[PDB]
Each structure stands twice: as C-alpha cells, then as structure tokens.
Amino acid sequence: LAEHLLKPLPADKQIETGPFLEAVSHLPPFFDCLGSPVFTPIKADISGNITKIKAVYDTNPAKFRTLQNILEVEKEMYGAEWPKVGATLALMWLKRGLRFIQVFLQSICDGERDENHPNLIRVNATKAYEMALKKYHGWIVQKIFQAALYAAPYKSDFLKALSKQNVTEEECLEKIRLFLVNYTATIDVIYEMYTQMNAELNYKV
Ligand SMILES: CCCCCCCC
C-alpha cells in the first residue's frame, strides 16, 4: 500500500493524468481480499471508471496531460452534454469512490469505533458512505449498501489482510496514515477542481 504512494502535489496543484491513473490502479485489487463476492461489482465500478479515463487519455496524452486538461478540453469538445459525459463523468464517480476509501481508512486510523462492537468496521464504513456516496444514491442502492455492509470483515482481519506481512497492527496503521497524506491532498484537489469548473452534478442513481 505504501509501495504505491501517490506523488505529492506540485506547486501549481495540477495533477498529471498518467501517473495518477497508474497510482490508483493499485487500489481495486485490494477488494479481492475483503473476503466476499459482494465487492466484485464495487471493484468493477472503480476499475471501470479508471479504464474510461485511461482510454480518453490514450487518444491524446498531451492534450489530456493533467486532470484539469481533461475537464476543460471536454467542456469545449462536448458543449451542452458536459459535464455528464466522457472522462469528466467517469472521474466524477471515481473521486467519490476514492473519497470513500479515504474517509474509511482515516476513520480506522483515527481510532473511531463502536464501543459496543469494537472489532467491527461498520461505523467506519458507514461514515465513509455518508460523506462520500449516500447523497447520490436512491433508496434502493442505499438498502443494498446496508446489506453489503455485513460482508465487511472484522477490523483485525482487514488490517492483517492489508499486510499481505510480518508486522504489528500499529505498524500497519502508521503505513496507512503515510499513504493517506498525498492521497487525501490529491483527492481534495480533484474535488476543488470539480467545484471551480462547476462540473459537479448531484443526480442520484
Ligand atoms: C494506468 C491505468 C490503467 C487502467 C487500469 C484499469 C483499472 C484497474
């Protein structure tokens, strides 16, 4: 996990597309080791969005050098259908996926738990869901999240799984905190970009 840290933000806060996609491409495979096929569709959504942005990038790497480039070029390229189109739309959903991972991990690292059920991660996943995803989900997808939530492993097993290995829980969390530095900064920059370009949409699914 700290074998594939995201690069720090450069001074101009512009995120290079290629290295960003390479970096986040290492996240989806962590879903295979949560212990349930319930996560298979979840992995597909994130992967699918990464693939969709990569494919737009591959048509003109120079034109789409940065993520900013993607949003502004597609704004010009598409007119009225933007921002509900192309790599812009893919990245709008990707960022929420990544933000969910961010809030989930930070909650774990911050020692947030249910005093009553302390070896579960339901409260952490629930907060992540509320902050990142829930307001863009209709009632049906929300009830599906609630069902999917029980496929969550214990905190102990999830952390041991991320050590895929000879290492204490405290060591593992410190590596995760390290990862979260440039991850969070990068995700924040992307959310800021959607706000400044007025590319953020609020429709539910
Ligand atoms: C460099 C990005 C490659 C696309 C990977 C798709 C999702 C894992």
Side-chain angles (χ1 to χ4, degrees), residues 23-42:
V24 302
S25 73
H26 303 265
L27 302 167
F30 287 97
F31 285 106
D32 300 320
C33 330
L34 259 62
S36 184
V38 171
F39 299 108
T40 285
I42 291 169

Side-chain angles (χ1 to χ4, degrees), residues 65-163 167-175:
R65 194 166 274 110
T66 73
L67 299 184
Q68 181 60 48
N69 285 0
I70 294 185
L71 264 64
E72 70 205 359
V73 167
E74 290 197 339
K75 189 200 183 160
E76 195 61 24
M77 200 192 301
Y78 283 102
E81 306 88 32
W82 191 91
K84 212 183 182 155
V85 296
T88 298
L89 183 52
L91 179 60
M92 190 187 83
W93 286 96
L94 178 55
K95 71 177 197 317
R96 298 165 175 172
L98 299 176
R99 177 75 90 74
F100 174 100
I101 292 171
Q102 177 204 283
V103 171
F104 178 65
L105 295 176
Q106 186 70 68
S107 183
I108 296 286
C109 286
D110 280 354
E112 290 162 15
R113 50 172 61 190
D114 189 357
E115 302 279 18
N116 310 312
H117 312 266
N119 200 35
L120 299 175
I121 57 193
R122 306 241 205 73
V123 71
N124 310 278
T126 290
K127 176 186 176 156
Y129 186 65
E130 278 159 13
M131 310 245 65
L133 291 174
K134 185 177 169 188
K135 79 163 287 225
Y136 315 106
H137 288 189
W139 80 265
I140 298 188
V141 177
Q142 288 192 19
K143 247 265 163 156
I144 294 158
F145 163 74
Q146 288 166 35
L149 183 52
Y150 297 95
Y154 292 113
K155 189 186 296 198
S156 65
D157 305 313
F158 173 67
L159 293 160
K160 194 238 150 62
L162 289 166
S163 302
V167 119
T168 64
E169 183 171 296
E170 284 85 2
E171 188 44 72
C172 180
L173 297 168
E174 202 54 56
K175 296 328 211 165

Side-chain angles (χ1 to χ4, degrees), residues 7 14-25 50 52-58 60-71 87 91 94 193:
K7 338 206 293 172
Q14 297 310 116
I15 300 150
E16 287 171 25
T17 297
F20 170 81
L21 296 173
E22 201 285 317
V24 302
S25 73
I50 293 166
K52 281 148 185 183
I53 300 145
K54 180 58 168 2
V56 170
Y57 172 74
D58 286 339
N60 203 334
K63 182 153 68 153
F64 295 122
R65 194 166 274 110
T66 73
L67 299 184
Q68 181 60 48
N69 285 0
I70 294 185
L71 264 64
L91 179 60
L94 178 55
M193 182 184 60

